[PDB]
Symmetry: C2
Subunit: 460 residues, 2 copies
């Protein structure tokens, strides 16, 4: 038994002052004057009390290049916890000619004992031959997985043809699974990529100009069209640019079940930061690339008027030295990815709520709740109500602080928002009503995290 | 020397009454005040049809298209058209020159009217990208079909599609696309068989408009990315006109074509008892009647700008019969070459959807300027080849197999009451048809070597 009193609680809907009362793992009662017989106090006067961040886009301990992502399931989840997030959903990668159960098995072992907070998996689909379509039944029922990434880019590495894409959409309809897509046209990027090399433009900046917004717009559009044709449901990850928001809007006007996600870097960074003398642009090499500043407003507007509806990290980080160095000679060999898991929550807060782009209630919805409802964790996660796992987060909105590698908790040598002056700070984080962070101290234990078995798809 | 007097001449721009004067193969002077007279009092005098979408003597299935380059071009001439552009099909692992060679031989001696070639592109590996220079300079070819559908038969991936667009930019070639998503159609197709829906009607429901809208959108997006120029063939539905419109508003060089069947027929005609729907099996399929208005509006306000037949005909007996058991085997195609000109007239001008001037532009001129045959073809001016057509707008007549000139057992517009009739057709100032008689000779037709791309 724990007792948070003094807090102003904030959810996707409600904003009120009251004490919450946790017993075991779950919130149990909310109000004035509860029955707190002999239970641990926690003072939350002055602070906001909010549900835990859910971060539906994480690639922890992944290979990309012959090298692996810096954070593991321990370093990763900890950093998430530090930066306000209590539950992640990671991308289980399948390898053509692939026991689907054996890939999953691998991702479980990658977590077990390391993870401090709760976590779930998405399942990547490489080919959708008869073999794989069969296995999908097992996984949705037994293995607690009900969402499915298809990459339309990374040619000869992860890329899938329209066939795979469509068969997977129609199955997903049949089984009740959200399909997700990395919507860029591999084929046009490969050509532009191999051409820019032909001409000796090897700098990291040419990572951005070799995958123009027109190519995201196109694949997003395409993936929407098949979803329409299949009668299925879509979640475009990482929308970076206006060309795609346009395509998502358009479909959601015709009432189809299309969904959208950004990340902070597209909300808070632009291309100009890559044009930088020495290898400094490799800090920003990730896909889709950073875009022109015009697009930040459009992305924001979309979140605000409910056109996009979740925010993830796409945390996939690599060290500037040694790792992002593989590829001094050419940008194709820069492993693509950023360290974004930690600051996410608070940049949403500081740049968004605090400068009047979204409401405080939307900030929760956009970082926590809506991601639970799409990925079938609701109401175990993503809210403060009676029954809900006690994934609470006390949050002090008055602190002003500068984001930095000197002070962050991810296991990497840089921070893409290095130097950003920012409001808000994570005081304490509970996961199923146990401290992971207290007064900004790691009091958690490795292995405490539990796998979340998600339910099948249901609108919002 | 020939002398057409009494005519009211009609072009893409002009409408006036005057005598034109042909000498040799070319119009030579026009105006008021020992040469062969031809009376055109009462009739319209207009430039020859150009039909930029023909598949004459083509294989599809293990069978071939009914009309050859003789029967075909004659029928065109009968129905008002003087110059065609046919689709030279390339096979993977393909001497590009040898494919062309084959398409020349298919014509030589058979063709009665003038003709050119498009070049199909199957793969755009280094080999083929190299050859393309020879062809655009030497072989007179400056337009290129890539099919995005017919999986494992003609279909190209986005790679081939993009490379070709960027090369086209580089050489000055119009790229053309058949814009349906092969992949989604294959699934829907093999699924509709799984369930035992083998009637010809399921040809239409296995390739919904959404899939044309998609490939159209897609092929437009690459064009933007390549800075190259596009011509979507056969736009059948609103989903694609939408996509074309949108790009043209942003000022890219995207072009659009329909055919009469999509202006004048709808799906309901397929739902018909016995194998009668197979008469309408072709790709894209007939659409709901809502779309005909949208297509017509586009032509009118200059969103689409050309009209072709996609003439690719097969006999209802024996040939269309190939797939009584299942619609995948029905060779996809219609007999559309002959009536095209006059359905554009009667349904379009006559019922007040287009102007008389636009009728020429939409059937003749604009196709010349996009395919690089202008001003040799597609107008009545001093210098232009005398591909004239005397045209009587007052005749009422019923379109029928009993009376048509294509070498096939049916007519898809069979029974349509229609205004207008082709009296006489000149090709380079020689009669191909006189007072509705075939006075032409096989082999008289000449290959037209087209120039590179330039706007409009
Ligand atoms: Mn991605
Ligand atoms: Mn990702
Ligand atoms: Mn076609
Ligand atoms: Mn065709």
């Amino acid at each position: 038994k724990k007792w948070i009193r003094g807090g102003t609680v904030v959810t996707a809907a409600d904003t009120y002052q009251a004490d919450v009362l946790i017993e075991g793992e779950r919130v149990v009662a909310i109000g004035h004057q509860l029955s707190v017989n002999g239970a641990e106090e926690i003072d939350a006067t002055g602070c906001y009390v909010i549900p835990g961040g859910i971060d539906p886009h994480t690639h922890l301990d992944m290979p990309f290049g012959g090298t692996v992502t810096a954070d593991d399931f321990f370093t990763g989840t900890r950093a998430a916890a530090f930066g306000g997030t209590t539950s992640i959903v990671d991308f289980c990668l399948t390898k053509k000619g692939e026991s689907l159960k054996s890939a999953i098995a691998t991702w479980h072992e990658k977590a077990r004992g390391k993870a401090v907070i709760d976590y779930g998996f998405h399942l990547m689909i490489a080919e959708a031959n008869d073999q794989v379509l069969e296995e999908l039944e097992s996984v949705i029922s037994s293995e607690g997985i009900t969402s499915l990434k298809v990459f339309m880019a990374y040619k000869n590495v992860f890329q899938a043809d329209d066939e795979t894409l469509f068969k997977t959409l129609v199955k997903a309809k049949e089984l009740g699974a959200l399909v997700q897509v990395h919507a860029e046209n591999g084929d046009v990027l490969d050509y532009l990529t191999k051409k820019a090399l032909a001409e000796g433009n090897t700098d990291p900046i040419y990572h951005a100009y070799t995958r123009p917004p027109e190519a995201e717009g196109e694949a997003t559009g395409r993936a929407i069209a098949l979803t329409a044709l299949a009668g299925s449901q879509l979640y475009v990850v990482h929308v970076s640019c206006a060309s795609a928001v346009q395509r998502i809007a358009e479909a959601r006007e015709k009432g189809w079940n299309v969904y959208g996600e950004t990340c902070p870097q597209y909300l808070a960074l632009d291309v100009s930061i890559m044009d930088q003398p020495d290898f400094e642009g490799a800090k920003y090499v990730w896909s889709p690339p950073l875009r022109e500043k015009w697009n930040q407003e459009v992305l924001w507007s979309a979140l605000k008027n409910g056109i996009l509806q979740t925010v993830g990290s796409d945390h996939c980080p690599f060290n500037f030295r040694g790792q992002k160095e593989l590829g001094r000679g050419d940008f194709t060999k820069i492993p693509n990815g950023g360290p974004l898991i930690e600051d996410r929550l608070t940049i949403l807060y500081s740049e968004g709520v605090r400068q009047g782009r979204i409401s405080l209630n939307q900030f929760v919805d956009i970082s926590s709740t809506k991601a639970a409802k799409l990925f079938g964790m609701f109401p175990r996660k993503g809210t403060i109500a009676v029954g809900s796992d006690a994934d609470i987060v006390i949050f002090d909105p008055h602190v002003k602080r500068t984001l930095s590698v000197e002070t962050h908790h991810m296991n990497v040598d840089y921070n893409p928002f290095e130097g950003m002056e920012v409001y808000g700070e994570v005081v304490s984080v509970l996961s199923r009503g146990s401290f992971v962070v207290r007064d900004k101290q790691f009091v958690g234990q490795a292995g405490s995290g539990q796998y979340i078995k998600r339910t099948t798809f249901e609108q919002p």
